Amino acid sequence: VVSFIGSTENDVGPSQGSYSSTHAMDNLPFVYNTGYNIGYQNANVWRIGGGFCVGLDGKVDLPVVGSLDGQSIYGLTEEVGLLIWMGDTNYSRGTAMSGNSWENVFSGWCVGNYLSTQGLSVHVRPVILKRNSSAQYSVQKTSIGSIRMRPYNGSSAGSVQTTVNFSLNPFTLNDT
Numbered sequence: 001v002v003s004f005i006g007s008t009e010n011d012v013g014p015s016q017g018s019y020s021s022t023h024a025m026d027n028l029p030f031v032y033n034t035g036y037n038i039g040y041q042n043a044n045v046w047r048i049g050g051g052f053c054v055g056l057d058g059k060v061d062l063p064v065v066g067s068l069d070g071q072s073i074y075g076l077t078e079e080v081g082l083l084i085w086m087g088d089t090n091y092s093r094g095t096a097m098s099g100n101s102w103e104n105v106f107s108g109w110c111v112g113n114y115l116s117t118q119g120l121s122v123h124v125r126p127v128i129l130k131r132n133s134s135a136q137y138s139v140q141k142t143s144i145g146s147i148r149m150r151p152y153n154g155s156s157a158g159s160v161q162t163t164v165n166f167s168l169n170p171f172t173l174n175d176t
């Protein structure tokens with residue numbers, strides 16, 4: 001048994017967020033290490049039971065303005081980009097992202113003959129692209145991508161909602 005209990009649209013990171021870094025941005029691109037603060041986590045998006053086996057798929061829509069260490073830097077504005085992560089519940093369980101096609105983000109599992117729940121989590125890292133002349137970057141609310149449950153081992157979804165989508169909450173990058 002499965003069931004959708006979460007929400008279709010989920011905002012990544014809080015609104016009006018301010019971030020700072022005194023590290024080093026000499027040789028762009030630079031990537032703020034804000035940990036997992038800009039993201040989304042709902043360990044309860046699908047209710048499952050009876051051997052139901054589920055995995056997790058993710059897909060970012062933003063264009064690939066490049067690639068950082070085998071990961072795809074996704075762009076928003078001329079000067080701003082991001083390192084995107086998607087996967088299962090525990091933020092630490094994230095799977096970096098490359099391209100704009102559906103990729104496996106969580107190997108999944110097979111619950112027992114009891115009632116549990118299936119979750120997901122997104123986390124992003126703000127990348128600075130092209131130079132500026134104010135040392136300040138704005139970020140307007142923009143779509144990012146989605147996650148879709150992956151029923152396997154003979155498991156079925158049916159008409160039960162399989163995908164939820166994400167959106168990047170606005171914010172601004174500082175540095176000083």
Ligand SMILES: CC(=O)N[C@@H]1[C@@H](O)[C@H](O)[C@@H](CO)O[C@H]1O
Pocket residue numbers: 042043044088089109116117118119120
């Ligand atoms: C904490 C909880 O009760 N629900 C978790 C769910 O968030 C997670 O997606 C799934 C697979 O790891 O395992 C469930 O037990």
